[PDB]
Write a protein that binds this ligand. Structure first.
Ligand code: ZN
Lengths: 397, 49, 350, 49, 397, 397, 397
């Protein structure tokens, strides 16, 4: 595997540092590495493809070295080189793709394809070099069993979930109390509603709570917390819990009272914030708990008083809410986020070549399904597959 | 006939594609050539469910 | 090339006038059929070379070394076939010959063999030196045949304890290489691929059309090859057969190692020299299997090796030019007569 | 070559194996419809691809 | 051009690796490259500026090369160097800016300025070196006529468009049916409304559809699709299509029924998703088609039934919607996105120096206007201009 | 300080380029640099920790150098090396953290810890090299006094502020006129409301204005400006200015009329946009001014006319709004943004080790408090502390 | 590819400059080139055909050189030569045809056939020569990514379109107002009709407009513009827009009033002509806009007055029109025109060999369909295919 990596940084730092002009001395250290490769390869034979709509292609090697002679570089030098690179590019592409499709339950971590299995061979190890590409960097550290870690912008930790829970309801759905939410990606919006505006509630306050359990721990998270859930601030006609009928939600928004956000790790409070809106840091957590209340306004102007009568019908439904967004965070496990193309690359190659559903990944590499049941096997396969996608993107985008 | 030659199925629909409009060519014939097949060809000969 | 100073002294009237040298290339590809004549060119180009290759200097007194050698060598210890490893002498010469000889060979794009001497294992060790550098690519397949197998068998394999099945080659893939796939001592293992793959990088087009089959920066003065050739040697010290064997063998090996600090120097030397001289060759030079050889007694080789000090010699300015000048003329004549030739023939037809 | 008369709207052309949108022909269609066996595409492209 | 690039990576890798102390043998390979430059330059004269409020500064060259001795670097060494760098910096800045304003209908892909035209000269090619900066990387691969590609977080593919289409309307605007939307940047929000709540519609279902045609194909797109269009979930007073009057929109939101998103390429469905909210992948498309329906609730509690009478006046307007956001994608053409400063750099330099409107770009480099009529000439000029901005940002931010 | 930097890029470019199988010559230039270090170190002893819960560990050096004759690295070579690296890693971590907690009002721009103060010593300068990490790059350029500059995605320039201003109000709060807003991070949403729908206003138009003063100048900003403030488009019950009662806000949204956005710098208009929604560039500004109007619709269908009577009660409250988001920008001062983990790293290390509140930073490194009173001392300390966090993240994430 | 080219100019300049008589000296430079070929070929083996009704043919090479001896050419010399040429001719034909049928979506630009793919090989490049054939000339310049350009007589830029638009109509179709047109090839004819002869129109003038958007920009166009649309100057019975009935058009022609032709490029007016009939130049445009009016004659003789009553029935329908023809123009993209046989050659070879419809081109290479959806893939394939047709026509017509 690491082998694979090199193959690319070789080509990149190649198709990059080798051009009509420059001095030999700037590539001397490079040129070498290169040749070294050609050698180890030549003589060997390969095979890629064979699954689904993926073409089968065989490759052989028999190439000349490089003029370690010249001082500067003349156009002619390049072209005779670029011609050799292009065969490797078109090669690697086919190599990546071939191993970017196969999955495996037992050992979903190690190589699969006839192409790569052959590379992990010892006789090729004579090629590793410059592993500064964030992903491979972490691939190694994990082999040696040590503390890994990646960086994500608007991570995708929450499987899509949009629902409600009626804590007080009745057939007519004319005096409900409960919460409704949307957990998706890196965002959570949750609203607590009480049709009665806490008219008969102790201290005229109704307590609400929303708990979200992450499938993986996030550390170093920069989070935006804002009062109100705009998504649940407008009139709605919703299906009843049993699907037998529809209820009416006509919200009027009040400020959430006694807001408390807790970021817990294994049941322990790691970070807690009381009514702090704006930017907050959650340094290590696997669970978020949002507690907030609706407090009936003790003093009301006529217009307000008119919305909240002492007796039904309750026509304006008191609602309080919160919005929480994880802007960035670090995770020890690979995840999809709003910037990296890994998930999209893997999903795209599989879709383009009509790769059949396998035993590990959900149909279509569906993110929600994947993160909902993020088993060790899915994670090992995902990491292998994401690391390969990242190796491929160094040359082919 | 949109095709080799006259033959109710294809052509008669290819022509008298009466009642329909607001889009592109093909679709209209296809459509009117559909009407036949379907609801018609069935009460005759074909495979599977 | 820093080491060399340049300067102008005389002026030039707008009266100045010269005649183009005319250095078109080959025009005639004799490289694919006229063996008989190539052999004659190579030879020529070769002698030419020796005439140039600077003579060496500051060597270690012949006597001194060979003497510490006997102390280390444990010569007469049972073994019947004595005084065959010391016909090494005349080194104050052998090295000079081995040195020159080696260059020209290369430059002149010649190919050779080896007055080899099976018994004399030392003479073999040094062989390993030779392949470590000189791109086997230009060594008639055969002389390499003997050499390697002699190493492979009467060395490594058994003293290293590995294949006590000594070995058996045919004529395609090489005993120096395949041995690889089947060896477990990385150090040993790198030598193998590097030696079997160091193909005199037959690819160059410099200073305007001068295909002069070149050679590795690595080798050049990255040298390490040597350092690695040594490190691999540093762990070949073990069992299998009689005592007077390992004792004698390894002891010799060490003389390569210590000296290794210097052996380095050798690499640099050639590296430069060839890499220098070459510059002034107009005639292109495709690698060809000459019909004739050139005997190179591991005798001399071995000498050069442990026998070079902090010496440092290079091509005298005047020397270099003289070289250019010649090839030049020659070329000019070749090209010219060619024209003179053609012209006639064609006329001869209409 | 799956020729699919998506009644009302649509029409697609495959290559029976590795599926693939590709020029649909009112012509090639014409005949091959007229007199050959048809199929009541249970599942169509959309669902299939 | 490529020439230009070097000039910088030269200086960066310079103003970076040349500090009081470091060991020489870390810059040996570098030092060289540097000198090589000075040489090629010395003996040349340049001129930049001359347009609008851009000064016309003149430059000459006549410098010495650095020492090669010294195990380590002494302070003195640096300062005598930094003094030489600063003249090149202040130079390049002026060079970039001068070629970052001119546009040419014809060859808007070739060099313009007297400054650069002179660089493409052959005698300067001896300076090229280390082309690994993502942009130049792609500049080359294109000049050779090959497959390019870039990376963008929240790309800016949709020209701003905020409008509506009334499929059923009447003078009083008291029983409308149609859609309203906002396409902007990487986001689309669209709502379908039916004042009658499909009371007389077949199967009590009203079909809606929203089609968006991209000006460039996006591949590898990671997309968030969510039900509801919050932007169109509140009461509005809107201008009529003819601008003669204003209508009232009083939405009540229902879940979009039979949601189907199609990502098409040249009329062909490449990806299709049926009612899948959350994260989805669209691997290659030039068009997005969102189809969704409003289905009159078959069962209604009294409160709901009251909103939807059998006869007008229709006072609560049934609305269904969708929100789609392209988090990341790859495009073969340069585009503005939410992270890169290229567009802003080009636009800013032109604004600061009062550069007159030219024949290629819309006034103010207006993004909406640019992407709406993204002609080949605008793209070639944009790419040239974006690549220069990226070269400049390696040294000057 | 710069010293510190090296220590890492040394290790990274080390734990990266040093692997089982790379040719020696690909690290010749590197190996050296490394050894050079060991030397300078060995002998001197260090103290880290000694505050809050941070442990006081003692580090001592006694190491043998690295090879020189290897032409391809064997496994054994690595392991004997990795063993030495791991002591430095675990070291630096402790070094960073120790200087990442101390603050100082007077000189809070220099080294504090006994650990680092010792490094700035001259006898160590001999290590510095490859200063390409964006942050250190700017650390230097500032020590010499020049144009610094960083890059941010969704910068965090606006301290959280959510409030309103009633320009016309009365006890019953039944006919208000004013604005309400939310400034947070990189976003601003502001709404102007007039319960009377400008019935008695000159030209039936009510003018609104929202001014936001940045604590630091932003240059090169790519900004999204959209009409409407969704956050203020729904019914609300709000506390009165004096907290004595609650008022009712029942918005109906109209398009903002005569929208004008001005990006000012020191009172001067640098950029101005009239009713331009979508993507706009603000090249240099310290203030944003949003002016917009509510114009009573001159022509109204019955449904609309019914919302706006000639006399109270005013039951539908005319509202116009704007949304502005800074997608990216450059700032000469460090700031938190939506992608970088610096703030989170610093905040997290302090929280984990129970570091006591100091004299410079607000409790909990609270971003809003920090940016609200972004004094020179807080900025110098923040930059020092952010630069260290970035050095640490090269090795430990 | 370029390779291919040579092969021909070789043969042409051969079957042309080699004949019973002439002096060697006139071909000396030629002869050489020739031989050079034979060599490179000999030994190699080929294969063409295999698709549709195209025969499969294998070819081998083993030919003698040419007598570079004589002062003149004797009949015998020719015949021994012509015999060798004829094998190459019959060869190339089969080569062209084989690559003139295959299409490809992904890479529709590069070679397809086993025959050609082998030619792009490096070992054959030893044959290029004299690329003055207009098409290859442009093939190269496009590889180097530069400004191309072709020449066309009566270009074929307008997909066939013959229709009408009724701006005022009623069931009886007895008082219509609108336009009808025919856009086809290089010509546009458009008529504006008003059954009422602008009797109730402001200023007794009815405005008309016809806009045509080209799929590719045309530069350097020489255009004939004439008043009147003869095609729409005669009585017609036309189908109604909905196809439910037929209407009667009984035109009487008046001179078009206030004629204005605008040639726009990306929305900008590049050329504008006011009432100028005859020959006009449009130098660069992607859109043509024709505006013209029908002005009711202010003074009418009895015979004229009788045609235009104050009240219906309107029996003579006032009509004004324009005719525009693009005689010649330059386009950066290949197009069909009235002189070149490229489209016909490609279409003919495909038809003759019963080549199956592929994934790129419309059935039958239909021009209207092709130009209507002239995608990048269709253009790249068209150019490849047109360039091959042009190479073939140098030898086989
Ligand atoms: Zn973002």
């Amino acid at each position: 595997m690491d082998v694979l990596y090199s193959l690319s940084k070789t080509l990149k730092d190649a198709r990059d540092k080798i051009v009509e002009g420059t001095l030999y001395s700037n590539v001397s250290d490079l040129i070498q590495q290169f040749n070294q490769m050609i050698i180890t390869m030549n003589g060997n034979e390969f095979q890629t493809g064979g699954i689904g709509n993926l073409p089968i292609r065989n490759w052989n090697f028999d190439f000349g070295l490089l003029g370690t002679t010249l001082l500067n570089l003349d156009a002619n030098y390049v072209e005779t080189a670029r011609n050799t690179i292009d065969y490797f590019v078109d090669f690697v592409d086919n190599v990546c793709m071939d191993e970017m499709v196969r999955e495996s339950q037992r050992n979903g971590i190690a190589p699969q394809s006839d192409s790569l299995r052959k590379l992990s061979g010892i006789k090729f190890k004579r090629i590793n070099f410059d592993n500064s590409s964030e992903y491979i960097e972490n691939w190694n550290l994990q082999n040696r069993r040590q503390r890994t870690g990646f960086t994500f912008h608007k991570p995708n930790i929450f499987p899509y979930s949009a629902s409600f829970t009626l804590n007080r309801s009745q057939p007519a759905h004319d005096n409900l109390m409960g919460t409704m939410w949307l957990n998706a990606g890196s965002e959570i919006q949750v609203a607590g509603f009480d049709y009665s505006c806490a008219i008969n509630a102790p201290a005229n306050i109704q307590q609400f709570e929303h708990i979200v359990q992450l499938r993986r721990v996030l550390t170093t998270a920069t989070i935006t917390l804002l009062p109100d859930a705009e998504r649940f601030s407008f009139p709605r006609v919703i299906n009843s819990a049993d699907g037998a009928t529809t209820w009416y939600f006509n919200p009027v928004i009040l400020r959430p009272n006694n807001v408390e956000v807790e970021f817990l790790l294994n049941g322990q409070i790691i970070n807690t914030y009381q009514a702090r809106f704006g930017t907050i840091i959650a340094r290590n957590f696997d669970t978020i708990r949002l507690s907030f209340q609706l407090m009936r306004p003790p003093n009301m102007t006529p217009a307000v008083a008119a919305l909240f009568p002492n007796a039904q019908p309750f026509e304006h439904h008191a609602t309080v809410g919160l919005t929480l967004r994880i802007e960035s965070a670090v995770c020890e496990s690979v995840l999809a986020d709003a910037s990296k193309t890994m998930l999209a690359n893997v999903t795209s190659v599989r879709q383009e070549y009509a790769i059949p559903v396998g035993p590990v990944f959900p149909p279509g590499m569906n993110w929600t399904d994947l993160i909902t049941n993020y088993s060790p096997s899915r994670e090992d396969n995902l990491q292998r597959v994401f690391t390969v996608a990242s190796i491929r993107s160094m040359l082919v985008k | 006939s949109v095709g080799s030659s006259a033959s109710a199925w294809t052509d008669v629909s290819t022509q008298i594609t009466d009642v329909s409009s607001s889009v592109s060519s093909i679709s209209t014939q296809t459509s009117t050539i559909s009407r036949r097949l379907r609801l018609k060809e069935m009460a005759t000969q074909t495979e599977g469910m | 090339d820093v080491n060399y100073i340049l300067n102008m002294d005389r002026n030039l009237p707008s009266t100045a006038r010269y005649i183009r040298p005319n250095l078109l290339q080959d025009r005639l590809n004799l490289h694919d059929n006229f063996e008989s004549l190539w052999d004659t060119i190579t030879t020529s180009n070769y002698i030419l070379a020796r005439s140039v290759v600077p003579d060496l200097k500051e060597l270690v007194s012949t006597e001194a070394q060979i003497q510490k050698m006997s102390q280390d060598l444990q010569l007469e210890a049972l073994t019947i076939q004595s005084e065959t490893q010391f016909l090494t002498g005349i080194n104050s010469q052998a090295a000079n010959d081995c040195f020159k000889t080696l260059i020209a060979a290369m430059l002149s794009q010649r190919t050779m063999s080896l007055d080899f001497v099976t018994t004399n294992y030392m003479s073999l060790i040094s062989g390993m030196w030779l392949l470590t550098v000189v791109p086997n690519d230009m060594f008639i397949r055969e002389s390499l045949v003997a050499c390697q197998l002699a190493i492979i068998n009467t060395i490594i394999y058994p003293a290293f304890g590995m294949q006590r099945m000594h070995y058996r080659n045919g004529d395609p893939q090489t005993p120096f290489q395949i041995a690889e796939q089947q060896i477990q001592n990385f150090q040993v293992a790198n030598w193998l691929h590097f030696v079997n793959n160091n193909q005199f990088r037959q690819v160059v087009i410099d200073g305007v059309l001068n295909q002069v089959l070149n050679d590795n920066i690595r080798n050049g003065h990255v040298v390490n090859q040597l350092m690695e050739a040594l490190m691999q040697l540093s762990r070949q010290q073990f069992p299998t057969m009689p005592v007077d064997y390992k004792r004698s063998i390894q002891r010799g090996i060490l003389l390569l190692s210590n000296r290794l600090g210097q052996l380095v120097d050798l690499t640099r030397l050639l590296a430069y020299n060839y890499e220098t001289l070459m510059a002034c060759i107009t005639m292109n030079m495709q690698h060809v299997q000459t019909l004739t050889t050139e005997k190179l007694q591991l005798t001399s080789v071995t000498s050069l090796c442990m026998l070079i000090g902090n010496a440092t010699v290079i091509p005298s300015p005047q020397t270099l030019f003289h070289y250019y000048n010649v090839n030049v003329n020659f070329h000019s004549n070749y090209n010219e007569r060619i024209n003179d030739a053609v012209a006639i023939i064609t006329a001869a037809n209409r | 070559e799956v020729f699919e008369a998506g009644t009302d709207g649509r029409f697609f052309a495959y290559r029976v194996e590795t599926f693939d949108e590709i020029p649909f022909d009112v012509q090639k269609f014409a005949d091959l419809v007229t007199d050959s066996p048809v199929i009541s595409a249970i599942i169509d492209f959309k669902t299939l691809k």
